[PDB]
């Protein structure tokens, strides 16, 4: 069983981070070194496992989550991070075992004048739990007055557009992100059996 990573990394569309996509993959074999050694990735960070030991992980399922964020937010896709992305859009668990892979996607996801397609959540009444998703669009009450469905002072639409422009600096350009999380019997995967 070869892991179907072609569908993940080379998907025809990528989700907004607030509506991040999850593909659930059963136990499978993959050549992780062709991924980890690829110059096409600007980030390849692993947690609870080293990239050279991915082939030896024992797991039941791997979740492949994917989305678009801007470059200076890739650092937030890690356990224990804070910020608008980690707190209100996509949150990893403390015992995350797997890797975070990103690459610059300016050539595909920017548009002259702005891209209105990719969004992120700006405000929330509480932080997301790990792997929670929130696609609601209720007006966010930042002040002392109920918004009651009207936008204005201290009453904000909760999503913001990235407006990815081709001439943005690299920290404001779009990056596609794939998060692989490995689970063994609903616990984190480990390198099991004879060492």
């Amino acid at each position, epitope marked *: 069983n070869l892991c179907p990573f072609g569908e993940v990394f080379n998907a025809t569309r990528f989700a907004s981070v607030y509506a991040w996509n999850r593909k659930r993959i059963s136990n499978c074999v993959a050549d992780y070194s062709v991924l980890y050694n690829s110059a096409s990735f600007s980030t390849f960070k692993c947690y609870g496992v080293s990239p050279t030991k991915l082939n030896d992980l024992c797991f039941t399922n791997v979740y492949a989550d994917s989305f678009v964020i801007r470059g200076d937010e890739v650092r937030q896709i890690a356990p224990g991070q804070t910020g608008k992305i980690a707190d209100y859009n996509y949150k990893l668990p403390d015992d995350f075992t797997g890797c975070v892979i990103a690459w610059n996607s300016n050539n595909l996801d920017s548009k002259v004048g702005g891209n209105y397609n990719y969004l992120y959540r700006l405000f929330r009444k509480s932080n997301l739990k790990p792997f929670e998703r929130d696609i609601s669009t209720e007006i966010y009450q930042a*002040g*002392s*007055t*109920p918004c009651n469905g*009207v936008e*204005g*002072f*201290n009453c904000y639409f909760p999503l913001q557009s990235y407006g990815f422009q081709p001439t943005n600096g690299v920290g404001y350009q779009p990056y596609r992100v794939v998060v692989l999380s490995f689970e063994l019997l609903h616990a984190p995967a480990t390198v099991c059996g004879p060492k």
Partner: antibody, heavy 117, light 108 residues
Framework: QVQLVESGGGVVQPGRSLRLSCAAS????????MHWVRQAPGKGLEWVAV????????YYADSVKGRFTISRDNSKNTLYLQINSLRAEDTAMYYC??????????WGQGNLVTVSS | NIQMTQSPSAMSASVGDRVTITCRAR??????LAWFQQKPGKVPKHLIY???TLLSGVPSRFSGSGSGTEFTLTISSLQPEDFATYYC?????????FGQGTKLEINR
């Protein structure tokens, strides 16, 4: 026509107490949070306090917390600011303001508090 | 509290001129900065919120910008009614806090 009418100011002796009132008319009072702002003679604006539309959350400027209490009686459509142990730093024109989605869109006329012997 | 500092404290200009007023927050306040106008002895008037959104009815010659800690109010083509004191106010976290004000006076 939204109206906010303040009362309760005047000359008051140091160490005493007072309550300013801000009587609301022409709108659903209980749908709006309310703020107090002040301006000492010849000085700039100072934010004083805010109370939630439903009277729950209340917040205060660092310099007034503990001695000032903001409150509201929605059954009487009235906002209040109560000051204990008055001192010279409290002398100021006090304004109430409505917080709406439109902004701070309506204000009281102001009431002058003069702390003096 | 978050300290707000305006600059200059006073400036002079003439009808038809463009003027720029600066407001700096000692801590990051994102884009949640308001601007007010006050004439002597009169009630303040709320002009701008969230750094750049005009209240309804406010002339677009008033233009707010900035984010984080540095913010500006730019008044293009001054009209006689514009000479007045202008105050910023951060509305990002409690307690809300005003800058000390900038007085816009008539040059001669």
């Amino acid at each position: 026509q939204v109206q906010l009418v303040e009362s309760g100011g005047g000359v008051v002796q140091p160490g005493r107490s007072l309550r300013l009132s801000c009587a609301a008319s022409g709108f659903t009072f209980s749908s709006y949070g309310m703020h107090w702002v002040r301006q000492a003679p010849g000085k700039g604006l100072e934010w004083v306090a805010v109370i939630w539309y439903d009277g729950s959350d209340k917040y205060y400027a660092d310099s007034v917390k503990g001695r000032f209490t903001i409150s509201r009686d929605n059954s009487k459509n009235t906002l209040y600011l109560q000051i204990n142990s008055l001192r010279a730093e409290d002398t100021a024109m006090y304004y109430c303001a409505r917080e709406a989605t439109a902004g701070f869109d309506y204000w009281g006329q102001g009431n002058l508090v003069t702390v003096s012997s | 509290n978050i300290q707000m500092t305006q600059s200059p404290s006073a400036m002079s200009a003439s009808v038809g001129d463009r003027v720029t007023i600066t407001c700096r927050a000692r801590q990051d306040i994102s884009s949640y900065l308001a601007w007010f106008q006050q004439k002597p002895g009169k009630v303040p008037k709320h002009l701008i919120y969230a750094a750049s959104t005009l209240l309804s009815g406010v002339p677009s010659r008033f233009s707010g910008s900035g984010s984080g800690t540095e913010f500006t109010l730019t008044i293009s083509s001054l009209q006689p009614e514009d000479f007045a004191t202008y105050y910023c106010l951060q509305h990002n976290s409690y307690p809300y806090t005003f800058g000390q004000g900038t007085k816009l006076e008539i040059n001669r």
